[PDB]
Write a protein that binds this ligand. Structure first.
Ligand SMILES: CC(C)(C)c1nc2c3ccc(F)cc3c3c(=O)[nH]ccc3c2[nH]1
Lengths: 8, 124, 284
């Protein structure tokens, strides 16, 4: 699995 | 495992999954494995919604980008679906009443630092 | 009373919830002839644990019953709890050890003890929730006790349900449908939980007749994440339950499915339960 987070 | 917070939150998911199954790009109970696979023969910007593997989250967004296939957790807190927040995120994360409405919004936003590219769904 | 400086560490018993249970021996004389007692301590001391751990003690302290584990005393190190030592350990592991040496009338005997324990628990307005074979203890071949009131809460004066809007990891298979949806735990949530406990008994939980393995088998061993809880609710709302235990009397499985009734009202009380248990006990 390759998870990330969103930057605004 | 995390049980539901309230009756409202349960009936929320019923409508969330209903509208998700009607959407066509909802892949039920699919792990992060096929995500890196099914989105390999798809152009960068192709996405899908699947059941999270973590016990904290219901659904999870997977999207093919230039760096590769990236997955995104979709938290449901107090009856609103939002993407997981970054510590370097200056602007607050958007909340939505429907899970589908979360998708349409993101179609600038970046991901750790390539941009967020939502273009085409993956039919099921 | 008690002093931890006299407690000699003999061995570790087991671990459950947010603490560790160790076999020690309190002997003020230090000549090593003292009586053996079980000791439960906190691994990581936090405010969200040390406070809740102490609430468990205050509950157990108010619990005095033959079928409720006997509270011994307390000592601090980071709190530390002193309780009686039950050699055969948990009902879960004991039922697996001696499958053959335990017959039908014995399983009904425990059930009667668990019921009478739940009645003494219910009269003081407590909701165990964590009712499972891993939380029930065995003093001797013919007597069992209920232990670990960690998840036990106190009922309000007016409200008959205790609702936790901020849930953590939970045994969702021992949970009632009402406990899965609104996270509301009633005395009927213990009747449901007892239903699964009653299931565990007549199976001895052999190989893959476990409440998780069975429920997972029904919803499919592919559905993962928090989405499992959802599918389980669909399964319970669609009147699907855990199958009949292998070689289980008919009247007993009926009771299981009647505790597994969706409606709270239709779930038989622990009064009605203990009656049928003893009714089938002396008949056989
Ligand atoms: C795991 C859990 C916390 C429920 C727990 N396990 C035990 C236990 C296990 C083996 C054994 F020989 C004794 C015990 C025991 C005991 O002897 N007294 C009180 C609790 C307790 C216990 N409490």
């Amino acid at each position: 699995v390759e998870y990330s987070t969103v930057v605004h | 495992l995390k049980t539901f917070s309230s009756k409202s939150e349960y009936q929320l998911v019923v409508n969330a999954v209903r509208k998700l199954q009607e959407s066509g790009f909802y892949w039920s109970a699919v792990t992060g494995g096929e995500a890196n696979l099914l989105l390999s023969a798809e152009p960068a910007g192709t996405f899908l919604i699947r059941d999270s593997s973590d016990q904290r989250h219901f659904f999870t967004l997977s999207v093919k980008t230039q760096s590769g296939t990236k997955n995104l957790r979709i938290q449901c807190e107090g009856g609103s679906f939002s993407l997981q927040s970054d510590p370097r995120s200056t602007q607050p994360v958007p909340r939505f009443d429907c899970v589908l409405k979360l998708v349409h919004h993101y179609m600038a936003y970046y991901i750790y630092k390539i941009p967020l590219v939502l273009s085409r769904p993956l039919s099921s | 009373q008690f002093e931890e400086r006299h407690l000699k560490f003999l061995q570790q018993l087991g671990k459950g919830n947010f603490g560790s249970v160790e076999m020690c021996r309190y002997d003020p004389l230090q000549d090593n002839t003292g009586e053996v007692v079980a000791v439960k301590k906190l691994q990581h001391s936090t405010e969200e644990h040390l406070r809740d751990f102490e609430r468990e003690i205050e509950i157990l302290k108010s619990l005095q019953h033959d079928n409720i584990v006997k509270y011994k005393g307390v000592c601090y190190s980071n709190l530390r709890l002193i309780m009686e030592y039950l050699p055969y350990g948990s009902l879960r592991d004991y039922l697996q050890k001696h499958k053959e040496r335990i017959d039908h009338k014995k399983l009904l005997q425990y059930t009667s003890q668990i019921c009478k324990g739940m009645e003494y628990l219910g009269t003081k307005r407590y909701i165990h929730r964590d009712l499972a074979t891993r939380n029930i203890l065995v003093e001797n071949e013919n007597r069992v006790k209920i232990g670990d009131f960690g998840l036990t809460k106190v009922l309000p004066q007016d409200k008959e349900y205790y609702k936790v809007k901020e849930p953590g990891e939970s045994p969702i298979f021992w949970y009632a449908p009402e406990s899965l949806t609104e996270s509301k735990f009633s005395v009927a949530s213990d009747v449901w939980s007892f239903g699964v406990v009653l299931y565990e008994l007549f199976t001895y939980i052999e190989k893959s007749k476990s409440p998780p393995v069975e429920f997972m088998r029904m919803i499919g061993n592919d559905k993962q994440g928090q989405m499992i809880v959802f599918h389980l609710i669909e399964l319970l709302k669609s009147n699907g339950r855990l199958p009949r235990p292998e070689g289980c009397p008919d009247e007993i499985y009926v009771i299981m499915t009647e505790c597994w009734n969706n409606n709270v009202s239709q779930r038989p009380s622990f009064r009605d339960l203990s009656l049928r248990v003893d009714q089938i006990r002396d008949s056989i």
